[PDB]
Amino acid sequence: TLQKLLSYTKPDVAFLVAASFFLIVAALGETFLPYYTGRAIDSIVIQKSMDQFTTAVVVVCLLAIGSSLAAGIRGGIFTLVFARLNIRLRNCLFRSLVSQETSFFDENRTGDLISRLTSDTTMVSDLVSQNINIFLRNTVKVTGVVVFMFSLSWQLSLVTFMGFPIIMMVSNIYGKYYKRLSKEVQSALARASTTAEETISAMKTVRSFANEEEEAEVFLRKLQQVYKLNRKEAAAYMSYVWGSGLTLLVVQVSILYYGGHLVISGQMSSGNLIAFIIYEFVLGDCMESVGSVYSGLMQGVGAAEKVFEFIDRQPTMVHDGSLAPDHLEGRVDFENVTFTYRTRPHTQVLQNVSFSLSPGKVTALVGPSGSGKSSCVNILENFYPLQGGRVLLDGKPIGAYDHKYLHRVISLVSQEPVLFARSITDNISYGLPTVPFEMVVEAAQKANAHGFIMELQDGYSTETGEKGAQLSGGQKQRVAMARALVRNPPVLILDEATSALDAESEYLIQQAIHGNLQRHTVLIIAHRLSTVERAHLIVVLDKGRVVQQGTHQQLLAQGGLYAKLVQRQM
Amino acid sequence: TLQKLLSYTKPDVAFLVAASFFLIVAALGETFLPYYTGRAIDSIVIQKSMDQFTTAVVVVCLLAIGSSLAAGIRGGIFTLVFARLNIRLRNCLFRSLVSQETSFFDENRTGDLISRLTSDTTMVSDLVSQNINIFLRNTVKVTGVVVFMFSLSWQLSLVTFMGFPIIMMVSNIYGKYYKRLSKEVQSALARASTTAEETISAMKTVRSFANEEEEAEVFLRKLQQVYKLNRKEAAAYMSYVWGSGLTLLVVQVSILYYGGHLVISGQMSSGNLIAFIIYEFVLGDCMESVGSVYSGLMQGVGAAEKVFEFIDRQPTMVHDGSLAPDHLEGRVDFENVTFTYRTRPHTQVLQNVSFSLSPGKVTALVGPSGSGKSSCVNILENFYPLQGGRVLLDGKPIGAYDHKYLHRVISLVSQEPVLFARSITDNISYGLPTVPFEMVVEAAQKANAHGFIMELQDGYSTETGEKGAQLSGGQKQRVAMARALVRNPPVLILDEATSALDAESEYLIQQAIHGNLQRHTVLIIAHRLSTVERAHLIVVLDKGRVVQQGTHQQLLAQGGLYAKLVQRQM
Ligand SMILES: CCCCCCCCCCCCCCCCCC(=O)O[C@@H](COC(=O)CCCCCCCCCCCCCCC)COP(=O)(O)OC[C@H](O)CO
């Protein structure tokens, strides 16, 4: 997958080569430093002079200042690459995530698709800011240090290189054993704590049995076992500290003592021995840090397969519409449509339904509250495709009209009309470009929204603050109705609350003034039967099939599947 | 606090004094080491001989071995103190988190009252062990190091003490500024992620407007602000590294050069210069470690307050009642009780109810399906207190009796009878010990619990696996029904949920043996109006006063609110 992660850095090679060059300079400065420290000490003790001027100068000016400056500049350019990579991953992932067909969002969760947008992209940008930085820096420094301490005195080099594996071996053995015993104690305490968790979380029954003493005592037993487990963990820790400490001591004193014999023999200088000891410590620390960072880098490159998982997934439907004639009537028809989801294809919610809607006239819908009525709402909004059948808007199917045009000639208001945390002069005129104020005023009046709006804390621009949860259901549905009416839509798809505790004048006036005195091929989805009393063609349905048509007077006349419900209401 | 926290270590004084002494020894050895290292280098350079061998000995054996062994023993004894303190706190906390009156369990949560237990007692023991370890160790070692590097050469100590505060001040300044800018960048990225989250989490209403593109654009610009906020953070990081590095360098080079002149002038000996530089490094490291760890210690004692608020919180309702007669009659009478909650004391959910149960005679209780009927069982089980009224039980009220004897005379069967993770021989004697297994199977046959026990995959003594889901509704109902008979209770209580998943076999076994044949003053709080199949009395009340009594044939005659329920339902 690293053939991809390169391609999302290809517009950053300028920053990358600048940062890499200054990284290499920083490492070389910090690995040429100890040799000249050794030359300084040797200039003190061997030739007692003021050659120390020139050597302290060589240390302080070029090597030290160069290391510090290059370190700062490498830090700067890597922070810049971090932010630019973060921004471009977030933008590409979103812009190709918000263009999937809705069944995508029905399958996958929402907390997961926000984890994969904040935390995962943070990890896959730290993979290039931090971990590759540290790993490459310390690799260059380790190579430099090894070559130096070979050039200085290869006897001590051979000694310490036969030495370091012994330290690593004993430390790793005892550390792994102690870690195992520590994990065992942690698991024992959690298992012993789950009993207290349950007896706390179900205190009613225990109270009913007067059995609290025999829960304190079982906790005392299930804990008093952990102590006898823990003594062994203490002993293992003690022996681990002894083992690591004494092996490190033996290697270090062997180094210093062989070095002493060399310096007295006359095969080195005091400066080169001090240089060798400092190089030994630097090599130890750098080996430690390189060994540490591999966990983080493995975790990062594992996280880099969640972003690229979604950042290019082909959508399963195309919005290939082209037509957009400005003049419609609104002949919503259905041609034996049967529809099922993509989540459970064997169950059925609509079977060969074929019912029409007369232009410019109300046409409600109702069912047994157990069959699929909402599914006709979700099919007409062109969310999901169809299995069998076809739907058409004034002759041509809805698969042919232009996308924004199609959802501008239809509308929707629903059971839970969500209002995004914005201004109410924006929530109303949501999807269409900045229509002026007076149209919004006429719209809010035409849904009894303008009533309360002027009585809020500012009027129209009262942004729906407090994380967008301040308004109540009545104003909610009325402002939603205002939102659909702004577009002047030839069709409308309306839904009604199950409690129906609102003013309720809006729906009857929609059957009377809002949609009856104008071209509005309104459809209704009614749970509360307070609107059955007036309609045009109540097409009651069940099991995904049409059973009755015509006015609900004939439903009362042919009292099948409907007259049973009106007695269930009273 | 600190005083009680000390009072919960009082049994550990032996372990504490032993570990403290060994901590002192380890710190003293590790601070005596570098002086003798400097003496070794001295003997290499100044008087080139094998007088070095004495000093390599006095470094490798005494100081190094002693330091490492003492560190091992200190680590071991602090692990033992950690586990003992953790155990004692958890035991005492759970001992006094189960003896509180149940209103205290209603008010508080249950996720908190386990997170508190586990993680907070972990923190309180971790405070003492880990951080008093680190703080006390580094205090002793820093005192020793300062005394030495004053003993060696005082001009050098005065120069490095003019040096270290300047390093600390410059690092402090620039680190504060850089952390400020990094925090602002994190906040801006989180804000833009929230504006993307409100569109991910509300996809359907967005799709309804063909408004994904403007959402992608809003996200793009809300990101392209972060880049401009981030360049300033890059410059802050640059200057932070430059400032810290250059100050540290100037201090170090001034010290090394002044030491060079000191060695040239005969004022010192090169071994003491190496000793002084090693002491400078050690002192810097330990100062940084203490400066890190004080914050963790303060956080630890800030968490250590959450335990002692519950350790000795006195219980509200004390079960000081102490009485247990041999035999009894079993006449329960709710006598003008004035019961009141403590979670919403404005309302009076039960005010002066008056009705008496009869020995062996069923007394069903149903109500208006919204009013307070579910409280009577909690009144009977002596959960909550009561202001006025006295439930007289055979000469004495319930409050006078023994706790265990009380809940051994009375039982209950909840709606969803909670059954903890045990075996189905444990549960059928929860509080009652030393039960013969044939009594268990007999009192399981009396409620038809023998059915799904033998066919379950382990025989009789099957453990309730998967955290209590290997049984179902009617199963666990028959289980709890088997519970309420193993104790031979002269009083019984029952309840049942609105689902009524059992196929009415519960009522067949109610009227079978322990409702008519055996003497059990059965009460019942039944939904769905199913208990009217048979009754020896019926109480229907509302909010404290009883409106209807007598057998249900009077309820047919006195058709108030009752005869309409059987016809409205289906
Ligand atoms: C960083 C900016 C530097 C600017 C220039 C300053 C010039 C003076 C400093 C020289 C540059 C060194 C830069 C990198 C060094 C980092 C590693 C380090 O500091 O290690 C020292 C400190 O490491 C420690 O923490 C020491 C603690 C243990 C003491 C070790 C004693 C000798 C080992 C034998 C004892 C055996 C027991 C071993 C237990 C670890 C080791 O001291 P040394 O005496 O070996 O050499 C230092 C030299 O004399 C400076 O002039």
Author numbering:
A (entry chain B), B (entry chain A): 169 to 738
Paper's wording?
The protein adopts the canonical inward-facing conformation in which the transport pathway opens to the cytosol and the two NBDs remain separate. Consequently, ΔTMD0 has two separate substrate binding sites, a central cavity in the cytosolic leaflet of the lysosomal membrane and an upper cavity in the luminal leaflet. The shape of the density clearly corresponds to a phospholipid molecule with two fatty acyl chains. Also, cardiolipins with four acyl chains cannot fit on the map. We, therefore, built an atomic model of the PG (16:0–18:0) molecule in the head-up direction as a phospholipid model. The bound PG mainly interacts through hydrophobic interactions between the lipid acyl chains and non-polar residues of both monomers, including L201, V227, L424, I442, I445, I446, F449, and V450. The inward-facing ΔTMD0 structure has a wide lateral gate facing the cytosolic leaflet of the lysosomal membrane, with an opening of ~18 Å in the largest diameter.
TAPL is a lysosomal ATP-binding cassette transporter that translocates a broad spectrum of polypeptides from the cytoplasm into the lysosomal lumen. TAPL is a homodimeric half-transporter composed of a transmembrane domain (TMD) and a cytoplasmic nucleotide-binding domain (NBD) with an N-terminal TMD (TMD0).
